[PDB]
Amino acid sequence: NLNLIDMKLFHHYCTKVWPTITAAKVSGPEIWRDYIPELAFDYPFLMHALLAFSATHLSRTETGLEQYVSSHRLDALRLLREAVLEISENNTDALVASALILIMDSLANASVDNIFEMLRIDEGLRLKIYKDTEGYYTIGIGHLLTKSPSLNAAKSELDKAIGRNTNGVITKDEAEKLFNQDVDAAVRGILRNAKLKPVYDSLDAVRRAALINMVFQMGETGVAGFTNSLRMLQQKRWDEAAVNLAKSRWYNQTPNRAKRVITTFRTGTWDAYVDSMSPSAWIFHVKGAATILTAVWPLSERSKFHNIISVDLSDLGDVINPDVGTITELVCFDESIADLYPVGLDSPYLITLAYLDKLHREKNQGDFILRVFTFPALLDKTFLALLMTGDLGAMRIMRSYYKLLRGFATEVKDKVWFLEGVTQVLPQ
């Protein structure tokens, strides 16, 4: 009676994941290889943060896990919650580790779930029982509840699939619970299909979702019919594949949805969606970890992360206090957002654009990472409010900030997984 799974993950951590932390030019092996493991045993919250991250990395070559990525992550927060009540009397080094581990974990799991977002845009999300184009009781995203003509029969199933009296009404979080089972089911089918299995395996995450999509719209055997375009895809003739599908009956039936799917295939990105995709959640998750970083800033040479953060990355002293007039010295980089310039006022959008600028100036491909990890948690209150409020302006920059990340990720020598979930680039 032991957690052979916890021990495996931990073993996985001490074995295959830490070299990826160091390779990312984030701290050295001294600390990630020997120091953290030691600390883990003393501080439960760090151990949990550590297992969640491990689970995350292991599960890209091993099924099942997933739930561990979620529970440990939960516990890490339960414990971090009360560890932070009195920061100054805790192990600031353990805190720093936990936060950094969680950040990378959130990055790797950023794209996890936009498939659900993908179909939401493409098919629609219904929270209360309704009837499909055939009169059947469905719910969520095209989820069939029963071919029975009894509304209450539907209710029973709906309450069976979930675990409570829904009266035929569910919460978004249940729709996806259901949707995801449906993706699982679809996947099994693809794999159990000779014409589809090869192409599917051949495909990365983003492009796999785009195929699932087709399988959701036209049905399995339906998709198996695009044999020409399926080959191109297999052989990775992206551009070729896109042109071939653009001239199929599917395309005429539904051009707009076809275009989005085509592009996803063509580009390997969520480009065709993100704009219609609800505010990227990972931003908030990183924000809840990095904030820890900003709350310990800075500590004595006593803690061995002293020289690793390198200093306080919060400081914007060289661009705050100006001279004459209320116009700042920030120049625009990456135009088509120059629109927001010359930030000619010490008013909204400042602090954020000042940090984005230091993120662009940070050529030490190690402190650049930390600026990436730290960004979400440095966003000031005002701006932050605007970002959630939908303020189209403030969404604009978060996209250029997301652009720097992809740029970095691409140009980098040794590709970094985990920022793979947030930039694609897989691997090279």
Added chain:
Amino acid sequence: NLNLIDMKLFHHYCTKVWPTITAAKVSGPEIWRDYIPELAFDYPFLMHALLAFSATHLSRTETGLEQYVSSHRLDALRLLREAVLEISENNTDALVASALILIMDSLANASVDNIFEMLRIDEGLRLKIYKDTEGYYTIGIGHLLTKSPSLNAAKSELDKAIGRNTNGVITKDEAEKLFNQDVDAAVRGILRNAKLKPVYDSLDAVRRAALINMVFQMGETGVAGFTNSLRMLQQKRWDEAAVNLAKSRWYNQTPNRAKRVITTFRTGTWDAYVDSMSPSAWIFHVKGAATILTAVWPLSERSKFHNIISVDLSDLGDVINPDVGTITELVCFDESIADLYPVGLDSPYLITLAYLDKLHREKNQGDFILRVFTFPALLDKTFLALLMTGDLGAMRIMRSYYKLLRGFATEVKDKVWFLEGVTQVLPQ
């Protein structure tokens, strides 16, 4: 929550223990470092074993444990019990490693089953509830049950931490378990005591048992009264400390028990009890384990051990088939046993002397260690009986067996712990 104690142990094994396993030659850093940890996550029975072993090694540096070492030990076996039920299936490499791990663990905890033997000869054993000649009552070795002058207070107390209703009588193992408790209880008192600790730490394991032996007899503070002698022992002035200890009221109150304990400090061996503590426990613990190291051969080529066992260790060969007559070709290589040669098919030490001979002839300390681990298993019935009856011949060949390990760990460049149990040769 988590089970950090376990994870600490497993991590300890993956960083501290396995290298000790290669230093011998059971070796293959690719088995003990890589293969076994992995195999461990499958097959709980291998993990416990592995965890127990590692708990033991850590114990030579951490004072807790003991139970986390007994609990797993019982578990490793309890599970390995049901394991050999279905050898001819699953993976046997796990069963194989388990044995290799269990055997090594036994050898390391041989000085524990010995201390039971030392005080057996000295204090005495009694599987009842007698009233000691000190006023109160007792059980087993010297476990005080009822101080109460009453013959009934114990006849309504004894059975308390034994599981089954002991009623009044107990088995060997039932005393051992409670003896080892009192032992450790006593080691704690010693470390808590500032007069003795400085010496106790200084002492090796054999001598540590002599000091404990005194403790049991005359109490913690009583021993502290030896001051002059203690320091001496602390300065490794063996010979002197022995002379000085003789001059004492303890030497006279009880002379024999004193001589034995004296020469024990003097030489750091068990010479004084040589012929009174025979059934060196592990011989039988190992027996039920090291057996499956012979049963599994020949190993399928798929087994990662295909080359580590190699030959049929249980194979005598031609020794038992002399060209003419009944006297075997075996020739004496020790001397304390030349009295048993030439051997001769008659017996009764034939089989044992034969196996003992392959051991001695064994160059390439790889199969050497294996024959050592395996010897206890190869010991035949009719011989085993002679031994536990105190046959001088039997007991002598056993000493010749131990003389072989002693001369081996010594001569070898890198000394190997876990063998410090049988003939010393410590610590580096």
